[PDB]
Write a protein that binds this ligand. Sequence first.
Ligand SMILES: CC(C)[C@H](Nc1ncnc2[nH]ccc12)c1ccc2c(c1)S(=O)(=O)CCC2
Length: 164
Amino acid sequence: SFSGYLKLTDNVYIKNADIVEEAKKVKPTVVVNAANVYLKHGGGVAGALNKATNNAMQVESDDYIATNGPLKVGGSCVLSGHNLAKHCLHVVGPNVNKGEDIQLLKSAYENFNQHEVLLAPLLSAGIFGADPIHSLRVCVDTVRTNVYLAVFDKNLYDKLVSSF
Ligand SMILES: CC(C)[C@H](Nc1ncnc2[nH]ccc12)c1ccc2c(c1)S(=O)(=O)CCC2
């Protein structure tokens, strides 16, 4: 199971950890990917999860987009978790560096409520340009299911916990 997490609320937990390493250790039912609408897993969390699958996540993702078209910002899709989890929930948070509306961050976190328990990153943080403190607050105020957040930066983890 999940270990070494700090409990923030009745249902939100947080740890300073690499989500790829956490997925390989736990093999959760659901791992969330910080996806873009095209499912092009080039960098950040998406690039790291895809590299751990030996590119099998990208091959599956390109077939999904060829059939269905792109996702919406704030939307999601369920695909295989490959060697990392039973399933991967690909969720698109708004990328502020592309001028996407930050209000769509709450819609993105609502996708988590369709799963009883998930391993996830903070949406729209990092190269998506949003304030991580804001992302954690939207997470706690929107997600009702059990979410285990992996934040791979000790300095940011300490700032998130000390300001919570
Ligand atoms: C540095 C943290 C803010 C964090 N990094 C991480 N958090 C957890 N496992 C990780 N493995 C490798 C890095 C990594 C973070 C959280 C969310 C997002 C990104 C980064 S991003 O990939 O830059 C863009 C998408 C959203």
